Amino acid sequence: EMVETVCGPVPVEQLGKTLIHEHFLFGYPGFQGDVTRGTFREDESLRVAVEAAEKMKRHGIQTVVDPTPNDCGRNPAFLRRVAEETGLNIICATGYYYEGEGAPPYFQFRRLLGTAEDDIYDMFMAELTEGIADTGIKAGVIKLASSKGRITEYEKMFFRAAARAQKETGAVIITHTQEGTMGPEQAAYLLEHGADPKKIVIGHMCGNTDPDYHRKTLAYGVYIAFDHFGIQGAPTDEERVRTLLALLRDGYEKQIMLSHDTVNVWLGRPFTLPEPFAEMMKNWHVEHLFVNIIPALKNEGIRDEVLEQMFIGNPAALFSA
Amino acid sequence: EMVETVCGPVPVEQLGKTLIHEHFLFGYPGFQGDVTRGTFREDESLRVAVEAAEKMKRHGIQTVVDPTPNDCGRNPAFLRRVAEETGLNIICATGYYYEGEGAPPYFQFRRLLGTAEDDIYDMFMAELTEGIADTGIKAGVIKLASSKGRITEYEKMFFRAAARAQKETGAVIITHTQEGTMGPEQAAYLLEHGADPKKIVIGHMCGNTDPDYHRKTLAYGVYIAFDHFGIQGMPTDEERVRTLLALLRDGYEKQIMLSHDTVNVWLGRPFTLPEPFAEMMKNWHVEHLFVNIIPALKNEGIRDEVLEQMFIGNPAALFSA
Ligand SMILES: [Co+2]
Ligand SMILES: [Co+2]
Ligand SMILES: [Co+2]
Ligand SMILES: [Co+2]
């Protein structure tokens, strides 16, 4: 009936059109050490984040799921400032990123102590049912992430703790897959530990261009996310649309959701992409799906009711019991 | 004639008895994501840090070098509070930890952009000559760290940038060696990039029990640090003293400094070591050198002049041009 947002409990039937995977803030672990030259400017960052929220609102978006990992600069209070200013529903996550772009030393040390897995479960439960730090904000999803070609022993601790927390709370699980790998493996591992398939979204599935890889993942009954639209230079958007069309014709519309995985404000030092990498990444923004991708899908005969199923129907079903 | 402390510029002649490597605060990368259950209690942390500083003062210590890495919870403003309350001189560092227990993803990403090495140099220069963030505090040393049996490509970026920054500023370099490896390799690599041996301290050298390994490092004209006194169970203190006595009998006192590498306040969740691992670690405190180690050295006939050279003479010479 209800889902926890950065502005408290909100009725699931009031979520409406949703983007399942976007970041208002994000930083690669280690950004904190570059504080001198890469200070977080809160006033300017809020202006940019509000601008992004208003851009999404213009295309009918009422809800955004922001799955920024705990070790990647997650800031629930900042998200609340964006939500209070715009009226946009923002759902945040509890969880850590994968090894390659995460900060494993902390929980690797606690693994040696023999408490890590219990500590992670304790963290999940606290942030889902009590609140994150002193913010008073509860996470609405659990964020999981795996490495390229494997779910590491470090990562598996989080996977097992997430499934355990999922059993107790009924919380949604949002995942990260690295370079189009471990899609079926994530689904299998979670269901083996008792997680609800109708509460799991396997993310970054667009990173793979083989439809059989998708069908294998979809067979577990889980949701999949084509959530990297705009990121190319990694498959192209043309390849993403091609894969998506093949699945929609097979009738997998009730298991697919779309997003950009944007980073609207980068934490740490500002940077500029070289050419032609910057030109290839020009469409990586929150309006891309609505300005470019959806029109391209409708040019390929995708009806409004199919698009509404992905953006409105699926998120509503995902967060409902 | 001056060195930057957390309270500003202090005459090198006034540094006196010094501990070359201690941490008031330290956290393994990833501790930030465990904020809900492992909150930073500043009032209690300050009390413990001040009590630690008063314990050092009891044994004549006037100066402490705190080389907490930028990615390991370095807090210059907190150190200033400790220094203002106790009158102790605290010198902090600029730099990142080694890959295994650091947060590489940030500068690894900037390496793909092609700016990382220049960004690191820029960071070093900013924090040595301008100030850290908005604290107004300048770092007095550059902290470098390498992995077990390898100075990785990531780590080398910092080593080269440190050598660049050292030539421009004359700043002291303090290093971390992992599990008694890379001592000679660190010295050799820094010197071939133009670093001043009289401004380099190769740390954690007591991690190796072979005196030939030390002599190979000492051959470069650098300082070495026996800075793990009290850490046992994971070489022993008996082996550390045996190695030290061999080097002092060879007449290397003008190149050796001693410390504990204590972590007085752990960032993140509190933890307890099992038995008999905790019993072996019971001497890991800031008074260990003065209550246990120095008396043991004096039992073996080590003169006060030699001890004063290590604790007073060497730090004075290190920070002097
Ligand atoms: Co991701
Ligand atoms: Co993401
Ligand atoms: Co160290
Ligand atoms: Co240390």
Side-chain angles (χ1 to χ4, degrees), chain A residues 89-124:
Chain A
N89 299 314
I90 305 167
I91 300 160
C92 72
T94 176
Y96 276 58
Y97 219 25
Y98 78 105
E99 278 196 52
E101 286 173 3
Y106 181 76
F107 277 115
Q108 288 283 52
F109 179 76
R110 302 199 81 86
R111 187 177 183 250
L112 266 294
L113 295 163
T115 59
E117 197 171 331
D118 287 332
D119 293 339
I120 293 156
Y121 169 75
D122 180 44
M123 179 188 72
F124 285 163

Short mmCIF file of all heavy atoms in Angstrom, two decimals, chain A residues 89-124:
data_model
loop_
_atom_site.label_atom_id
_atom_site.label_comp_id
_atom_site.label_asym_id
_atom_site.label_seq_id
_atom_site.Cartn_x
_atom_site.Cartn_y
_atom_site.Cartn_z
N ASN A 89 8.41 12.75 -6.13
CA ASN A 89 8.68 11.64 -5.23
C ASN A 89 10.05 11.06 -5.52
O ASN A 89 10.35 10.70 -6.66
CB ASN A 89 7.61 10.54 -5.37
CG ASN A 89 6.21 11.02 -5.03
OD1 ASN A 89 5.99 11.68 -4.02
ND2 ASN A 89 5.25 10.67 -5.88
N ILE A 90 10.90 10.99 -4.50
CA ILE A 90 12.22 10.38 -4.64
C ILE A 90 12.38 9.24 -3.64
O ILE A 90 12.24 9.44 -2.43
CB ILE A 90 13.38 11.41 -4.50
CG1 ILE A 90 13.20 12.57 -5.49
CG2 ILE A 90 14.74 10.74 -4.70
CD1 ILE A 90 14.08 13.78 -5.23
N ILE A 91 12.66 8.05 -4.16
CA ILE A 91 12.89 6.86 -3.35
C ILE A 91 14.38 6.55 -3.36
O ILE A 91 14.97 6.38 -4.43
CB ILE A 91 12.08 5.65 -3.88
CG1 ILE A 91 10.58 5.95 -3.85
CG2 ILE A 91 12.40 4.39 -3.07
CD1 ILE A 91 9.74 5.07 -4.77
N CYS A 92 14.99 6.47 -2.18
CA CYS A 92 16.42 6.18 -2.09
C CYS A 92 16.71 4.75 -1.64
O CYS A 92 15.79 4.00 -1.28
CB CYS A 92 17.14 7.20 -1.19
SG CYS A 92 16.81 7.06 0.57
N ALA A 93 17.98 4.37 -1.68
CA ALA A 93 18.40 2.99 -1.45
C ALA A 93 19.30 2.80 -0.24
O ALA A 93 19.88 3.76 0.28
CB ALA A 93 19.08 2.44 -2.70
N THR A 94 19.39 1.55 0.20
CA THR A 94 20.41 1.11 1.14
C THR A 94 21.22 -0.01 0.49
O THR A 94 20.65 -0.94 -0.09
CB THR A 94 19.80 0.66 2.50
OG1 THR A 94 20.84 0.15 3.35
CG2 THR A 94 18.73 -0.42 2.31
N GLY A 95 22.54 0.11 0.54
CA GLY A 95 23.42 -0.89 -0.06
C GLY A 95 24.77 -0.34 -0.49
O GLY A 95 24.98 0.87 -0.49
N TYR A 96 25.68 -1.24 -0.85
CA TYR A 96 27.01 -0.87 -1.31
C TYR A 96 27.18 -1.24 -2.78
O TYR A 96 26.46 -2.10 -3.30
CB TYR A 96 28.09 -1.57 -0.48
CG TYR A 96 28.46 -0.87 0.82
CD1 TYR A 96 27.50 -0.60 1.80
CD2 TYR A 96 29.78 -0.51 1.08
CE1 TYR A 96 27.85 0.03 2.99
CE2 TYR A 96 30.14 0.12 2.27
CZ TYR A 96 29.16 0.39 3.22
OH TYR A 96 29.52 1.00 4.40
N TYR A 97 28.13 -0.59 -3.45
CA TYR A 97 28.40 -0.85 -4.86
C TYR A 97 29.26 -2.10 -5.02
O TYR A 97 29.67 -2.72 -4.03
CB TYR A 97 29.08 0.37 -5.50
CG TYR A 97 28.61 0.68 -6.91
CD1 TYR A 97 27.35 0.27 -7.36
CD2 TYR A 97 29.41 1.40 -7.79
CE1 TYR A 97 26.91 0.56 -8.65
CE2 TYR A 97 28.98 1.70 -9.08
CZ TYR A 97 27.73 1.28 -9.50
OH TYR A 97 27.29 1.56 -10.77
N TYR A 98 29.52 -2.49 -6.27
CA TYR A 98 30.37 -3.64 -6.56
C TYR A 98 31.84 -3.30 -6.31
O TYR A 98 32.20 -2.13 -6.21
CB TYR A 98 30.13 -4.16 -7.99
CG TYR A 98 30.81 -3.37 -9.09
CD1 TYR A 98 31.94 -3.86 -9.73
CD2 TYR A 98 30.30 -2.14 -9.51
CE1 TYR A 98 32.56 -3.15 -10.75
CE2 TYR A 98 30.91 -1.42 -10.54
CZ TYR A 98 32.05 -1.93 -11.15
OH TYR A 98 32.66 -1.23 -12.16
N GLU A 99 32.68 -4.33 -6.19
CA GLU A 99 34.09 -4.16 -5.79
C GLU A 99 34.89 -3.15 -6.62
O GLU A 99 35.60 -2.31 -6.06
CB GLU A 99 34.82 -5.50 -5.77
CG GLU A 99 34.60 -6.29 -4.49
CD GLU A 99 35.60 -7.41 -4.31
OE1 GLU A 99 36.82 -7.16 -4.39
OE2 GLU A 99 35.16 -8.56 -4.09
N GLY A 100 34.78 -3.24 -7.95
CA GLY A 100 35.56 -2.41 -8.87
C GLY A 100 35.36 -0.91 -8.74
O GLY A 100 36.29 -0.13 -8.95
N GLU A 101 34.14 -0.51 -8.40
CA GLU A 101 33.81 0.91 -8.21
C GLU A 101 33.18 1.17 -6.84
O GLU A 101 32.40 2.11 -6.68
CB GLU A 101 32.91 1.41 -9.34
CG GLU A 101 33.63 1.62 -10.67
CD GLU A 101 32.69 1.96 -11.82
OE1 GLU A 101 31.47 2.10 -11.60
OE2 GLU A 101 33.19 2.09 -12.96
N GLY A 102 33.51 0.32 -5.87
CA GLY A 102 33.03 0.48 -4.50
C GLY A 102 34.16 0.72 -3.53
O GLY A 102 35.31 0.91 -3.93
N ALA A 103 33.84 0.72 -2.24
CA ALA A 103 34.85 0.83 -1.19
C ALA A 103 34.80 -0.38 -0.26
O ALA A 103 34.28 -0.29 0.86
CB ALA A 103 34.66 2.13 -0.41
N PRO A 104 35.35 -1.53 -0.71
CA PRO A 104 35.26 -2.77 0.07
C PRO A 104 36.09 -2.90 1.36
O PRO A 104 35.71 -3.71 2.21
CB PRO A 104 35.67 -3.85 -0.94
CG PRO A 104 36.48 -3.15 -1.96
CD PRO A 104 35.90 -1.78 -2.06
N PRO A 105 37.19 -2.14 1.53
CA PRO A 105 38.05 -2.40 2.70
C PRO A 105 37.33 -2.49 4.05
O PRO A 105 37.70 -3.32 4.88
CB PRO A 105 39.02 -1.22 2.70
CG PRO A 105 39.12 -0.84 1.28
CD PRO A 105 37.74 -1.02 0.73
N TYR A 106 36.31 -1.65 4.26
CA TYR A 106 35.59 -1.60 5.53
C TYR A 106 34.90 -2.92 5.88
O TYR A 106 35.18 -3.50 6.93
CB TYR A 106 34.58 -0.44 5.53
CG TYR A 106 33.80 -0.29 6.82
CD1 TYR A 106 34.39 0.27 7.95
CD2 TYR A 106 32.47 -0.70 6.90
CE1 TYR A 106 33.67 0.42 9.14
CE2 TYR A 106 31.75 -0.56 8.08
CZ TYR A 106 32.35 0.00 9.19
OH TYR A 106 31.64 0.15 10.36
N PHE A 107 34.01 -3.39 5.01
CA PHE A 107 33.30 -4.63 5.26
C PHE A 107 34.12 -5.90 4.98
O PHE A 107 33.75 -6.99 5.42
CB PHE A 107 31.94 -4.66 4.55
CG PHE A 107 30.84 -3.96 5.31
CD1 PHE A 107 30.24 -2.81 4.80
CD2 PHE A 107 30.41 -4.45 6.55
CE1 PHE A 107 29.23 -2.17 5.51
CE2 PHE A 107 29.41 -3.80 7.26
CZ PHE A 107 28.81 -2.66 6.74
N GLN A 108 35.22 -5.74 4.25
CA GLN A 108 36.19 -6.83 4.10
C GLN A 108 36.90 -7.07 5.43
O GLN A 108 37.17 -8.22 5.80
CB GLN A 108 37.22 -6.54 3.00
CG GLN A 108 36.67 -6.61 1.57
CD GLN A 108 36.49 -8.03 1.06
OE1 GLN A 108 35.85 -8.87 1.71
NE2 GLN A 108 37.02 -8.31 -0.13
N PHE A 109 37.20 -5.99 6.15
CA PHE A 109 37.79 -6.06 7.48
C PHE A 109 36.83 -6.70 8.48
O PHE A 109 37.24 -7.51 9.32
CB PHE A 109 38.22 -4.67 7.96
CG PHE A 109 38.82 -4.66 9.35
CD1 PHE A 109 40.12 -5.11 9.56
CD2 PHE A 109 38.09 -4.18 10.43
CE1 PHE A 109 40.68 -5.10 10.84
CE2 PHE A 109 38.65 -4.16 11.71
CZ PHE A 109 39.94 -4.62 11.91
N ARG A 110 35.55 -6.35 8.38
CA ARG A 110 34.52 -6.91 9.25
C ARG A 110 34.20 -8.36 8.91
O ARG A 110 33.69 -9.10 9.75
CB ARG A 110 33.25 -6.04 9.25
CG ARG A 110 33.50 -4.60 9.68
CD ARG A 110 32.23 -3.89 10.11
NE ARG A 110 31.85 -4.21 11.49
CZ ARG A 110 32.31 -3.60 12.58
NH1 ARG A 110 33.19 -2.61 12.47
NH2 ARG A 110 31.89 -3.98 13.78
N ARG A 111 34.51 -8.76 7.67
CA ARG A 111 34.39 -10.16 7.26
C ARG A 111 35.44 -11.01 7.97
O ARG A 111 35.17 -12.14 8.38
CB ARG A 111 34.52 -10.30 5.74
CG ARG A 111 34.25 -11.71 5.21
CD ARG A 111 34.33 -11.77 3.69
NE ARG A 111 34.00 -13.11 3.18
CZ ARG A 111 34.88 -13.95 2.63
NH1 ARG A 111 36.15 -13.60 2.49
NH2 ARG A 111 34.47 -15.13 2.20
N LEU A 112 36.64 -10.45 8.12
CA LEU A 112 37.72 -11.09 8.88
C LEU A 112 37.38 -11.21 10.37
O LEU A 112 37.80 -12.17 11.02
CB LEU A 112 39.04 -10.32 8.70
CG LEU A 112 40.05 -10.72 7.62
CD1 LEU A 112 40.66 -12.10 7.90
CD2 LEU A 112 39.48 -10.66 6.21
N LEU A 113 36.63 -10.24 10.88
CA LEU A 113 36.13 -10.28 12.26
C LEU A 113 35.00 -11.30 12.41
O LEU A 113 34.78 -11.83 13.51
CB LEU A 113 35.65 -8.89 12.70
CG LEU A 113 36.66 -7.75 12.82
CD1 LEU A 113 35.94 -6.42 12.85
CD2 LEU A 113 37.55 -7.91 14.05
N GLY A 114 34.29 -11.56 11.32
CA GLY A 114 33.21 -12.54 11.29
C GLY A 114 31.84 -11.95 11.57
O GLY A 114 30.91 -12.68 11.93
N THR A 115 31.70 -10.64 11.38
CA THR A 115 30.44 -9.95 11.68
C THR A 115 29.81 -9.26 10.47
O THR A 115 28.64 -8.88 10.52
CB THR A 115 30.61 -8.91 12.81
OG1 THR A 115 31.59 -7.93 12.42
CG2 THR A 115 31.05 -9.57 14.12
N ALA A 116 30.58 -9.12 9.39
CA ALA A 116 30.17 -8.32 8.22
C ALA A 116 28.75 -8.59 7.73
O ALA A 116 27.96 -7.66 7.61
CB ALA A 116 31.17 -8.49 7.08
N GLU A 117 28.45 -9.85 7.44
CA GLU A 117 27.15 -10.23 6.87
C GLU A 117 25.99 -9.86 7.80
O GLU A 117 24.95 -9.38 7.34
CB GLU A 117 27.12 -11.72 6.52
CG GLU A 117 25.98 -12.11 5.58
CD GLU A 117 26.09 -13.53 5.07
OE1 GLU A 117 27.22 -14.05 4.96
OE2 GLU A 117 25.04 -14.13 4.77
N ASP A 118 26.17 -10.09 9.10
CA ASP A 118 25.19 -9.70 10.11
C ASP A 118 25.11 -8.17 10.25
O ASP A 118 24.03 -7.62 10.45
CB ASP A 118 25.50 -10.35 11.46
CG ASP A 118 25.19 -11.84 11.48
OD1 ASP A 118 24.29 -12.28 10.73
OD2 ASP A 118 25.84 -12.57 12.26
N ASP A 119 26.26 -7.51 10.13
CA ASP A 119 26.33 -6.04 10.18
C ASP A 119 25.59 -5.41 9.01
O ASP A 119 24.91 -4.39 9.18
CB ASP A 119 27.79 -5.56 10.18
CG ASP A 119 28.55 -5.94 11.44
OD1 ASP A 119 27.92 -6.22 12.48
OD2 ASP A 119 29.80 -5.96 11.38
N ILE A 120 25.74 -6.00 7.83
CA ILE A 120 25.09 -5.51 6.61
C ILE A 120 23.57 -5.67 6.70
O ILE A 120 22.82 -4.75 6.36
CB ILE A 120 25.65 -6.22 5.35
CG1 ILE A 120 27.11 -5.83 5.12
CG2 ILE A 120 24.83 -5.86 4.11
CD1 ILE A 120 27.91 -6.85 4.32
N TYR A 121 23.12 -6.84 7.17
CA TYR A 121 21.70 -7.08 7.41
C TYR A 121 21.14 -6.09 8.43
O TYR A 121 20.06 -5.54 8.23
CB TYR A 121 21.47 -8.52 7.88
CG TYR A 121 20.07 -8.79 8.39
CD1 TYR A 121 19.00 -8.93 7.51
CD2 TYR A 121 19.81 -8.91 9.76
CE1 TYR A 121 17.71 -9.17 7.97
CE2 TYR A 121 18.53 -9.15 10.23
CZ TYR A 121 17.48 -9.28 9.33
OH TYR A 121 16.21 -9.53 9.80
N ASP A 122 21.89 -5.87 9.50
CA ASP A 122 21.55 -4.90 10.54
C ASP A 122 21.40 -3.49 9.95
O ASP A 122 20.47 -2.76 10.30
CB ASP A 122 22.60 -4.92 11.65
CG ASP A 122 22.31 -3.93 12.76
OD1 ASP A 122 21.15 -3.84 13.21
OD2 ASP A 122 23.26 -3.24 13.20
N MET A 123 22.33 -3.13 9.06
CA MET A 123 22.29 -1.86 8.36
C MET A 123 21.06 -1.75 7.46
O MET A 123 20.36 -0.73 7.48
CB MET A 123 23.58 -1.66 7.54
CG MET A 123 23.63 -0.35 6.75
SD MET A 123 25.03 -0.26 5.63
CE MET A 123 24.56 -1.44 4.37
N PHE A 124 20.80 -2.79 6.67
CA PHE A 124 19.63 -2.83 5.79
C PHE A 124 18.34 -2.61 6.57
O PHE A 124 17.53 -1.75 6.21
CB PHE A 124 19.55 -4.15 5.01
CG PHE A 124 20.54 -4.26 3.88
CD1 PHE A 124 20.82 -5.51 3.32
CD2 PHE A 124 21.16 -3.14 3.34
CE1 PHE A 124 21.72 -5.63 2.26
CE2 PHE A 124 22.07 -3.25 2.28
CZ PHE A 124 22.35 -4.50 1.74
#
